[model samples]
Target: AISDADLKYLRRCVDLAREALDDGDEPFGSVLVDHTGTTLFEDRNRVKDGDATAHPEFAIARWAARHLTPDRRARATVYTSGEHCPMCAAAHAWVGLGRIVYATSSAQLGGWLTEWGAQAAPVATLPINTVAPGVVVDGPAEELAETMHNLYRAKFGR
Candidate 1:
């Protein structure tokens, strides 16, 4: 289970993304703390049926491009699901652009982690256990922000 503080941060990220999208602006990209690397929130856009051009990361980047300044960029991206395995389509959604994290139940943790590492090229993995007795991990937001900045630069250059 995530701590109250972490949960609050997560909600804030989600709210920010929602507000941006509601205003007809793109609201993708977000920051998370270090230690656990908890996802604050992720964009909720899915490519419509038969929409070949709809890549989730691009949708997110388009959203980010709208709200972020020319110099600012998304720190990290995350994917969460109820299924036991990390879905390929979902992983592909974030691979080429940003650090990708995954959240799953403890029961599914091992397999998801392995699959994500194997299939998702160049994507970072963070396992989220949000059930009761959740792991409590903490780290400075600034450090996390810097780490993400470096990640983006390394993957796509400044």
Candidate 2:
């Protein structure tokens, strides 16, 4: 279940997703926050330049690795509009970041893409826990489902 606190952060990620969409990029976004509830970094998808690996979650992982101590990374949380792809998840785990709270899961995004008759993503839609077994995770906030669906529809022009 998404607490009010979680929604506060997740909502920002959702807004960032909208920002990305408006910028001609994919509708995905993420914010990295420390244990004390302060945001440390944020980013949205930047793959429109042809860098498929330029995902927001991956950016957060790299940012955390470079800026935070291991202990701090272990206590921080990442809020994302979509669940991380395997690449981002791997980077996140390798950086030893903490819990993840996403508005939508990769599975949900895949289903939406299928529904829109969009081509499948090249990467498999695996859950965060599957890729990073030790990282705590929560998501698929149903309250944000319609918003995400709308965003994806806009992305596919469907």
Candidate 3:
């Protein structure tokens, strides 16, 4: 269980993430939660492991991509195949961060299915909404936050 002080700190982090998302300033923000849906640490920046090479985004993206069906990948291609593909760009950025678990054919993706076999898992399909022509929310802040909390609870058994 988290102490009251820890919980307070977590809330502050969540508020910061919420504000960043609401203002349309940050492309991605996340709040790590305890098993009870209590916030642990939240940040607009990517989370790195002690090794200095491991990043959470790479794991998360690989997990998401591996679970995507062939049809889904095709659909993703339709939504992302263009000169200024924001989704592709985001994937590229994630890969560049060295968060990618496996090597990808293109500079953008990490080849989730072929690279990380057991590390990937299927997750709920969250809708990515287009706020503008090239701008997408990926998922709503509130919903994504709740999903993360639930996932933490399920995995960690708080």
Candidate number achieving the greatest lDDT relative to the actual structure: 2
Model 1, span 1-158: residue lDDT tens:
34455545544544444444554432322333223465432543233345434333344445555554433333443332211122222332323223333222323333433544533323233332221112222322332333333322332232
- Between prediction 2 and prediction 3, the one with superior lDDT is 2
**CA-RMSD of model 3:** 18.0
Best by TM-score: 2
Task: List the candidate numbers ranked by lDDT, top first.
Answer: 2, 1, 3
Ten consecutive residues with minimal summed lDDT in candidate 1? 80-89
Model 1: lDDT equals 0.35
Clash pairs (backbone) in predicted model 3: 58-99
Q: What lDDT does the true structure give each of the candidates?
A: 0.35, 0.92, 0.30
- Candidate 1 wrongly placed segments (more than 4 Å): 1-3, 8-42, 52-56, 74-102, 105-158
Return whichever of 1 and 3 wins on TM-score. Answer: 1
- What would the per-residue lDDT of candidate 3 be over residues 1-158, giving only the tens digit for each residue? 33454334334444543444455432223333333444333344232223422233333335435554333332221111101123433553332211111111111211222233323223222222221223222211232345334322332232
* TM-score (C-alpha) between model 2 and the true structure: 0.97
Which prediction has more favorable TM-score, 1 or 2? 2
Backbone collision tally, model 3: 1
